[PDB]
Scaffold this active site. Structure first.
Site, PDB file in Angstrom:
ATOM      1  N   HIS A  85      -6.071  -4.226  -4.399  1.00  0.00           N
ATOM      2  CA  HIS A  85      -4.964  -4.198  -5.405  1.00  0.00           C
ATOM      3  C   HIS A  85      -5.658  -3.427  -6.754  1.00  0.00           C
ATOM      4  O   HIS A  85      -5.644  -3.993  -7.760  1.00  0.00           O
ATOM      5  CB  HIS A  85      -4.494  -5.381  -5.689  1.00  0.00           C
ATOM      6  CG  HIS A  85      -3.648  -5.853  -4.516  1.00  0.00           C
ATOM      7  ND1 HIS A  85      -3.400  -7.400  -4.442  1.00  0.00           N
ATOM      8  CD2 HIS A  85      -2.987  -5.352  -3.521  1.00  0.00           C
ATOM      9  CE1 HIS A  85      -2.780  -7.421  -3.544  1.00  0.00           C
ATOM     10  NE2 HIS A  85      -2.606  -6.341  -2.918  1.00  0.00           N
ATOM     11  N   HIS A  87       5.998  -6.089   7.247  1.00  0.00           N
ATOM     12  CA  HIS A  87       5.522  -5.828   5.708  1.00  0.00           C
ATOM     13  C   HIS A  87       5.018  -4.474   5.534  1.00  0.00           C
ATOM     14  O   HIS A  87       4.266  -3.982   6.031  1.00  0.00           O
ATOM     15  CB  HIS A  87       4.527  -6.969   5.348  1.00  0.00           C
ATOM     16  CG  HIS A  87       3.970  -6.723   4.191  1.00  0.00           C
ATOM     17  ND1 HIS A  87       4.790  -6.341   2.847  1.00  0.00           N
ATOM     18  CD2 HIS A  87       2.969  -7.029   3.416  1.00  0.00           C
ATOM     19  CE1 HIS A  87       4.045  -6.418   1.775  1.00  0.00           C
ATOM     20  NE2 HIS A  87       2.994  -6.694   2.017  1.00  0.00           N
ATOM     21  N   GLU A 134       3.413  -2.719   3.073  1.00  0.00           N
ATOM     22  CA  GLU A 134       2.303  -2.490   2.207  1.00  0.00           C
ATOM     23  C   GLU A 134       1.242  -1.619   2.605  1.00  0.00           C
ATOM     24  O   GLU A 134       0.854  -1.608   4.084  1.00  0.00           O
ATOM     25  CB  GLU A 134       1.668  -3.901   1.685  1.00  0.00           C
ATOM     26  CG  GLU A 134       0.714  -3.915   0.409  1.00  0.00           C
ATOM     27  CD  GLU A 134       0.419  -5.264  -0.022  1.00  0.00           C
ATOM     28  OE1 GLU A 134       0.688  -6.193   0.499  1.00  0.00           O
ATOM     29  OE2 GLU A 134      -0.404  -5.298  -1.002  1.00  0.00           O
ATOM     30  N   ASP A 160      -1.913  -1.473   3.244  1.00  0.00           N
ATOM     31  CA  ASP A 160      -2.939  -2.058   4.010  1.00  0.00           C
ATOM     32  C   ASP A 160      -2.320  -2.649   5.455  1.00  0.00           C
ATOM     33  O   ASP A 160      -3.044  -2.810   6.297  1.00  0.00           O
ATOM     34  CB  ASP A 160      -3.574  -3.107   3.445  1.00  0.00           C
ATOM     35  CG  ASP A 160      -2.689  -4.275   3.335  1.00  0.00           C
ATOM     36  OD1 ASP A 160      -1.501  -4.113   2.947  1.00  0.00           O
ATOM     37  OD2 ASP A 160      -3.261  -5.538   3.177  1.00  0.00           O
ATOM     38  N   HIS A 173       4.747 -12.417   0.620  1.00  0.00           N
ATOM     39  CA  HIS A 173       4.872 -12.425  -0.847  1.00  0.00           C
ATOM     40  C   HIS A 173       5.431 -11.127  -1.495  1.00  0.00           C
ATOM     41  O   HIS A 173       5.566 -10.669  -2.384  1.00  0.00           O
ATOM     42  CB  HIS A 173       3.315 -12.470  -1.409  1.00  0.00           C
ATOM     43  CG  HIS A 173       2.461 -11.224  -0.853  1.00  0.00           C
ATOM     44  ND1 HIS A 173       2.325 -10.200  -1.511  1.00  0.00           N
ATOM     45  CD2 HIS A 173       1.767 -10.993   0.216  1.00  0.00           C
ATOM     46  CE1 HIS A 173       1.469  -9.214  -1.096  1.00  0.00           C
ATOM     47  NE2 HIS A 173       1.175  -9.870   0.092  1.00  0.00           N
ATOM     48  N   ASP A 181       0.806 -11.216   6.361  1.00  0.00           N
ATOM     49  CA  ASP A 181      -0.154 -11.734   5.180  1.00  0.00           C
ATOM     50  C   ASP A 181      -0.381 -13.309   5.227  1.00  0.00           C
ATOM     51  O   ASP A 181      -1.414 -13.849   4.900  1.00  0.00           O
ATOM     52  CB  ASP A 181       0.348 -11.518   3.930  1.00  0.00           C
ATOM     53  CG  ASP A 181       0.099  -9.763   3.628  1.00  0.00           C
ATOM     54  OD1 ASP A 181      -0.764  -9.277   4.463  1.00  0.00           O
ATOM     55  OD2 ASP A 181       0.564  -9.399   2.702  1.00  0.00           O
ATOM     56  N   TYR A 215      -7.622 -16.386  -1.069  1.00  0.00           N
ATOM     57  CA  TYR A 215      -6.552 -15.821  -0.805  1.00  0.00           C
ATOM     58  C   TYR A 215      -5.285 -16.325  -1.432  1.00  0.00           C
ATOM     59  O   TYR A 215      -4.477 -15.677  -2.162  1.00  0.00           O
ATOM     60  CB  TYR A 215      -6.314 -15.294   0.495  1.00  0.00           C
ATOM     61  CG  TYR A 215      -5.123 -14.448   0.775  1.00  0.00           C
ATOM     62  CD1 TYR A 215      -3.966 -14.679   1.271  1.00  0.00           C
ATOM     63  CD2 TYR A 215      -5.259 -12.947   0.742  1.00  0.00           C
ATOM     64  CE1 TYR A 215      -2.862 -14.001   1.553  1.00  0.00           C
ATOM     65  CE2 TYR A 215      -4.274 -12.353   1.157  1.00  0.00           C
ATOM     66  CZ  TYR A 215      -3.054 -12.728   1.436  1.00  0.00           C
ATOM     67  OH  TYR A 215      -2.052 -11.849   1.760  1.00  0.00           O
ATOM     68  N   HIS A 223      -4.433 -10.241   8.403  1.00  0.00           N
ATOM     69  CA  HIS A 223      -6.090 -10.261   7.976  1.00  0.00           C
ATOM     70  C   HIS A 223      -6.694 -11.321   8.493  1.00  0.00           C
ATOM     71  O   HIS A 223      -6.228 -12.576   8.367  1.00  0.00           O
ATOM     72  CB  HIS A 223      -5.761 -10.516   6.368  1.00  0.00           C
ATOM     73  CG  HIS A 223      -5.296  -9.161   5.856  1.00  0.00           C
ATOM     74  ND1 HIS A 223      -5.853  -7.906   5.848  1.00  0.00           N
ATOM     75  CD2 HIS A 223      -3.844  -9.026   4.961  1.00  0.00           C
ATOM     76  CE1 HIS A 223      -5.232  -7.001   5.146  1.00  0.00           C
ATOM     77  NE2 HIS A 223      -4.195  -7.581   4.333  1.00  0.00           N
TER      78      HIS A 223
HETATM   79  C1  LIG Z   1      -0.053  -8.016  -5.757  1.00  0.00           C
HETATM   80  C2  LIG Z   1       1.008  -7.293  -6.316  1.00  0.00           C
HETATM   81  C3  LIG Z   1       2.133  -7.838  -7.030  1.00  0.00           C
HETATM   82  C4  LIG Z   1       3.241  -7.335  -7.227  1.00  0.00           C
HETATM   83  N1  LIG Z   1       4.231  -7.701  -7.966  1.00  0.00           N
HETATM   84  C5  LIG Z   1       5.292  -7.032  -8.382  1.00  0.00           C
HETATM   85  C6  LIG Z   1       6.371  -7.394  -9.252  1.00  0.00           C
HETATM   86  O1  LIG Z   1       6.171  -8.696  -9.844  1.00  0.00           O
HETATM   87  N2  LIG Z   1       7.217  -6.648  -9.711  1.00  0.00           N
HETATM   88  C7  LIG Z   1       7.546  -5.552  -9.128  1.00  0.00           C
HETATM   89  O2  LIG Z   1       8.688  -5.125  -9.341  1.00  0.00           O
HETATM   90  N3  LIG Z   1       6.659  -4.874  -8.218  1.00  0.00           N
HETATM   91  C8  LIG Z   1       5.387  -5.681  -8.010  1.00  0.00           C
HETATM   92  N4  LIG Z   1       4.647  -5.035  -7.167  1.00  0.00           N
HETATM   93  C9  LIG Z   1       4.838  -3.827  -6.569  1.00  0.00           C
HETATM   94  C10 LIG Z   1       4.221  -2.642  -7.349  1.00  0.00           C
HETATM   95  O3  LIG Z   1       4.468  -2.680  -8.773  1.00  0.00           O
HETATM   96  C11 LIG Z   1       4.561  -1.308  -6.761  1.00  0.00           C
HETATM   97  O4  LIG Z   1       3.707  -1.371  -5.316  1.00  0.00           O
HETATM   98  C12 LIG Z   1       4.101  -0.349  -7.507  1.00  0.00           C
HETATM   99  O5  LIG Z   1       4.588   1.025  -7.055  1.00  0.00           O
HETATM  100  C13 LIG Z   1       2.393  -0.014  -7.475  1.00  0.00           C
HETATM  101  O6  LIG Z   1       2.193   0.860  -8.369  1.00  0.00           O
HETATM  102  P1  LIG Z   1       0.505   1.352  -8.545  1.00  0.00           P
HETATM  103  O7  LIG Z   1       0.304   2.143  -7.395  1.00  0.00           O
HETATM  104  O8  LIG Z   1       0.489   2.377  -9.810  1.00  0.00           O
HETATM  105  O9  LIG Z   1      -0.195   0.274  -8.564  1.00  0.00           O
HETATM  106  C14 LIG Z   1       3.368  -5.918  -6.810  1.00  0.00           C
HETATM  107  C15 LIG Z   1       2.448  -5.277  -5.993  1.00  0.00           C
HETATM  108  C16 LIG Z   1       1.270  -5.955  -5.448  1.00  0.00           C
HETATM  109  C17 LIG Z   1       0.239  -5.538  -4.674  1.00  0.00           C
HETATM  110 FE   LIG Z   2      -2.279  -7.573   3.515  1.00  0.00          FE
HETATM  111  O   LIG Z   3      -0.963  -6.962   2.308  1.00  0.00           O
END
Ligand SMILES: Cc1cc2nc3c(=O)[nH]c(=O)nc-3n(C[C@H](O)[C@H](O)[C@H](O)COP(=O)(O)O)c2cc1C
Ligand SMILES: [Fe+3]
Ligand SMILES: [O]
Ligand SMILES: Cc1cc2nc3c(=O)[nH]c(=O)nc-3n(C[C@H](O)[C@H](O)[C@H](O)COP(=O)(O)O)c2cc1C
Ligand SMILES: [Fe+3]
Ligand SMILES: [O]
Lengths: 400, 400
Positions: free
Chosen positions: A22, A78, A80, A82, A146, A165, A193, A226
């Site tokens: 992250h 999910h 994400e 990863d 999450h 996750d 974690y 993971h």
């Molecule tokens: C740990 C984590 C927490 C996140 N929390 C939020 C959130 O609270 N609200 C939201 O709209 N997106 C949330 N996101 C999604 C990110 O904002 C989204 O992936 C964004 O496009 C990433 O931008 P970046 O690549 O510049 O970091 C979260 C993502 C991660 C990994």
């Molecule tokens: Fe993960």
């Molecule tokens: O993840």
């Protein structure tokens, strides 16, 4: 690949090197793994992929296991990076292969890959996918656990819960199963974690687990995205999650600060002495945020009944690393925790009050602040020590 | 030691190694020096000391220059650790030696050393101290430049202004004088120092300089507490300070951000393209705050007419390093600068609005924010590029 159980094959990737998740907000000091699974019954099902860094390795290793055209279904628990990072590379070879995921996953998958022409199949809790030989997949939606798109996939007969996750940890090891690794290191990575990632969604953890338990599905193994596959007493991690979600706290106080001339450090150490000589039951940890592992600090906050945060006044505001950490804590939503701000100043000060307010904004129940001017002398250190005493008495879990 | 001029001897300490100042908030990439001066006329006067790390070296080197008992007066322009750190060690040998300083310095000296029994002599602007041979010291109070206790000491005849922190820089070199070192590196360290340390007190710089100029004191050399002695066209740094204090800005835009999956980075680069193709006069710099030198980022902010700050949404708040940097900028009090917040989000977002507000709280004049969901596709990147165009048009110093 590695045989998880029967026709379930682990086709993931170990990551001995990774240190940053992250951005740089999660430090993986013991590496990690990206678990993907290939189930070979009457139908062939791929569950999740791996991090984009190992995209070419993933597809090549997958080819060595099976003809890609023989893969019938792909399950994305999910979307994400990863876990869905190697998806584009894979779908480039087998673009017609159906993808099973939540409705929210269509938005997150398309959001990164920009391939809406893929064949998506929205699943919701209770939906099934027959794969033959008397076995089927059962999907369980877990929104905001999450991510909005998050879900789990249960395989009947083999009784394996593909939890993605959930219940996973960043722990790289040649062995796949929980009973084959260092138990202390496993616990530490599991707790690290949860504390750093899942804390803000703790209110959602118990109801979802209760819901799943009502399904009365037998669990032989929990296969996460993971770290280890839980096969020996697999629900031990579920029980830990139930404990951790209940606004978890030990009789512990975490003290952290930043300092320019060690004046606030001197205050922190004296505070700790006052605590220790007042309440022997309280465990105390002290960190300098500029010299310590941030995720370790947050794990200790998670474990603590309360915290004291220190900063000096720097240009009428607080030290930036403290401001950053308080912002991050604001997002993590710690509950039933107490706090007290402290620190040194040169003239007009103000950072201590400013920090106390932001700790309150972060959700901590605030006790009085502690202030000192320049370097604390013997008299001032007595006051700091007394502050630790007063805090220890107030935050006592039990009388005396 | 080194002869500065006539009977003025540099008895300071070079620091080739130092990388961290004020905790870790100021990175000294080219080391530093701690300048102390011994004047040997009819009276012997020590001006300032050095950092505590070199306390034993300082006193020993001082002994090699003069019998410590023969030191008549000690002048403390400023009682910060890096100038008054070796004071205790010195006063332990010559406790009766009078100290000349501002009233505020009594509070700051006693605040760290806890030796109020020392013989303090409060000086104010215009006060003199005769040292014989027709020469005298003239003191000039400079409160909040950059500490409450700060002052300068002028030596008549030799026409040397002992400016302490003012006009100094963190630049370690074997050569003592400004005309003997790399001019580009000197400028860079001077500007880095002003931007990161003196910016919040810019409103006080011009009136104090104007006051001093009214004294009509000839200046052959400016001997600071850090870096080179200005002997060749010494007022060049004074002129730079006058320029820098006037809410300094170039036709320049600084873009910085933090990112977890490079989505905000993609936005930042597109914004920059839009700017560059709209206004060729604007210089653009881009930084990832997690991977860059923070002090370099702030020097560029100082040099810029405006900034764009990027963050993704992380647990409903902004990324902590961005929160930390905005707090620090709030303390630095940048003036006549414009800003725009941007970033990516997954679902409900919120960090971009949150950041825009805090940039406003930091004193920036805000333009509209730029938002995008997940990874920007071609259409989204066009919007980001258009945002850079719109910003470039709005922040134009001149038409077209
Ligand atoms: C740990 C984590 C927490 C996140 N929390 C939020 C959130 O609270 N609200 C939201 O709209 N997106 C949330 N996101 C999604 C990110 O904002 C989204 O992936 C964004 O496009 C990433 O931008 P970046 O690549 O510049 O970091 C979260 C993502 C991660 C990994
Ligand atoms: Fe993960
Ligand atoms: O993840
Ligand atoms: C760069 C800098 C800025 C400072 N700004 C303030 C200020 O705005 N208000 C104040 O009361 N003290 C200010 N101080 C003084 C410090 O708060 C004081 O030295 C404090 O005792 C240091 O605490 P620490 O050693 O824990 O960092 C400043 C000090 C430095 C070095
Ligand atoms: Fe200094
Ligand atoms: O300083």
């Amino acid at each position: 690949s590695i045989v998880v159980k029967n026709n379930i094959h682990w086709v993931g990737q170990r990551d001995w090197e990774v240190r940053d998740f992250h951005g740089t907000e999660y430090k993986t000091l013991r590496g990690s793994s990206y678990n993907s699974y290939l189930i070979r019954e009457e139908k062939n099902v791929l569950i999740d992929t791996v991090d984009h860094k190992f995209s070419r390795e993933f597809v090549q290793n997958l080819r060595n296991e099976i003809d890609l055209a023989d893969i019938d279904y792909i399950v994305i628990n999910h979307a994400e990076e990863d876990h869905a990072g190697a998806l584009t590379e894979l779908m480039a070879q087998i673009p017609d292969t159906p993808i099973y995921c939540t409705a929210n996953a269509i938005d997150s998958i398309n959001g990164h890959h920009h391939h809406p022409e893929w064949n998506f199949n929205v699943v919701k809790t209770g939906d099934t996918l027959d794969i033959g030989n008397g076995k089927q997949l059962i999907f369980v939606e877990t929104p905001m656990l999450h991510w909005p798109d998050s879900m789990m996939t249960y395989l009947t007969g083999d009784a394996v819960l593909f939890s993605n996750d959930a219940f996973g940890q960043h722990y790289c090891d040649e062995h796949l199963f929980n009973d084959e690794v260092d138990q202390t290191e496993l616990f530490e990575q599991c707790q690290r974690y949860y504390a750093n990632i899942l804390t803000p969604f703790s209110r959602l953890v118990t109801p979802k687990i209760t819901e799943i338990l009502g399904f009365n599905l037998p669990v032989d193994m929990i296969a996460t995205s993971h770290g280890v596959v839980w096969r020996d007493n697999p629900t031990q991690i579920v029980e830990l999650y139930l404990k951790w979600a209940a606004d978890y706290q030990e009789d512990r106080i975490t003290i952290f600060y930043d300092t320019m001339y060690n004046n606030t450090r001197m205050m922190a150490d004296a505070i700790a002495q006052g605590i220790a000589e007042t309440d022997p039951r309280v465990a105390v940890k002290i960190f300098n945020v500029a010299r310590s592992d941030k995720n370790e600090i947050l794990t200790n906050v998670f474990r603590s009944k309360g915290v004291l945060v220190g900063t000096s006044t720097m240009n009428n505001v607080m030290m930036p690393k403290i401001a950053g950490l308080v912002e991050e804590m604001t997002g993590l939503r710690f509950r039933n925790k107490r706090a007290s701000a402290f620190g040194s100043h040169g003239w007009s000060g103000g950072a201590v009050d400013r920090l106390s307010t932001r700790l309150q904004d972060a959700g901590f129940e605030m006790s009085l602040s502690l202030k000192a001017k320049w370097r604390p002398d013997q008299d001032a250190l007595k006051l700091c020590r007394e502050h630790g005493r007063e805090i220890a008495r107030q935050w006592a879990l039990a009388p005396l």
